[PDB]
Amino acid sequence: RELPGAWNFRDVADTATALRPGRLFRSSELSRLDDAGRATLRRLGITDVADLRSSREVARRGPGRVPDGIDVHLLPFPDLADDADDSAPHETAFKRLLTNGESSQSINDAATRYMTDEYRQFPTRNGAQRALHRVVTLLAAGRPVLTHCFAGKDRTGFVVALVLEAVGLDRDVIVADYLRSNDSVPQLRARISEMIQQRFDTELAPEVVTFTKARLSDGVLGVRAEYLAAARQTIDETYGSLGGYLRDAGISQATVNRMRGVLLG
């Protein structure tokens, strides 16, 4: 099951078999969705898209190329305010990942540090709870939803895993679906490489192209159970339970119980 023009696409029920098929989907960005990809979204009955990319990402790579009749909910994560102080932490963390030195071990140690520390902050970050609130509300209402970001692996992974835990699925099932993102690493690598080739002059700055590709092609493209567990520990420590977290995000147990009624076989 492919989604032409996009990658890392699956019906979450493909691995989480307790779920009804056709309710909750996940993918990469839909910036390059082609005719066949659009026909697929329609065939599957998907009515709503949750676009988790920051507004900066959407501006630079474009809106989802969805067919008519599909509402795209823009659900930026992080949701950044005219405020350089707001974006600074994100820019600084990315710069450190890139510019921390040449060995694969050091490059991948930096990727592990970056990813882990960002996941730890996922629950408390502006935009994550609004994203989760909308996705849960749409799902509880019986609407088939496709949730995505850029890679569809971390931000998307976090939102999906919380939805699955909310409807009562076990850890091994949630983690299995989460790790499925690793099957798309080579494709992600190619997408990012093509992006590097266009944002940089490959003739006049080939050293920068080479340096950058070396930090955006290996360990940093995967997911690991420890990443998700770090977000999940934040939820535990600060909110005391997933239910406590969902309530702070404005979602009641009654809405959760309705979503469970809808999503489970």
Positions marked active-site: 149
Q: Does position 6 bind ligand 7XY by CB under 6 A? A: no
Site for ligand 7XY in 209-248 (CB under 6 A): 212, 216, 220-221
Site string for ligand 7XY, 54-83 (x = CB under 6 A): x-xx--xx---------------xx-----
Quote the least distance from Cβ 20 to ligand 7XY, whole Å: 25
Measure the CA–CA gap between 147 and 173, rounded to whole angstroms: 18
Site string for ligand 7XY, 187-206 (x = CB under 6 A): -----x--xx--x-------
Nearer to ligand 7XY, 30 or 256 (CB): 30
Quote the least distance from Cβ 252 to ligand 7XY, whole Å: 26
Nearer to ligand 7XY, 150 or 166 (CB): 150
The DSSP result for 122-153, as a single string, is TTTSTTHHHHHHHHHHHHHTT--EEEE-SSSS
Q: Site size for ligand 7XY, by CB under 6 A?
A: 30
Quote the least distance from Cβ 208 to ligand 7XY, whole Å: 7
Nearer to ligand 7XY, 181 or 255 (CB): 181
Nearer to ligand 7XY, 71 or 91 (CB): 91
Site for ligand 7XY in 88-147 (CB under 6 A): 90-91, 94-95, 97, 118
Measure the CA–CA gap between 184 and 200, rounded to whole angstroms: 24
Measure the CA–CA gap between 21 and 15, rounded to whole angstroms: 10
Return the DSSP state at 259. H
End-to-end CA distance of the chain: 21
Measure the CA–CA gap between 155 and 147, rounded to whole angstroms: 10
Measure the CA–CA gap between 167 and 256, rounded to whole angstroms: 7
The residues that bridge with 26 in the sheet, in sequence order, are 10, 147
Q: At a CB cut-off of 8 Å and minimum separation 6, what does 140 contact? A: 255, 256, 258, 259, 262
Provide the binding-site residues for ligand 7XY, judged by CB under 6 A: 54, 56-57, 60-61, 77-78, 87, 90-91, 94-95, 97, 118, 149-156, 192, 195-196, 199, 212, 216, 220-221
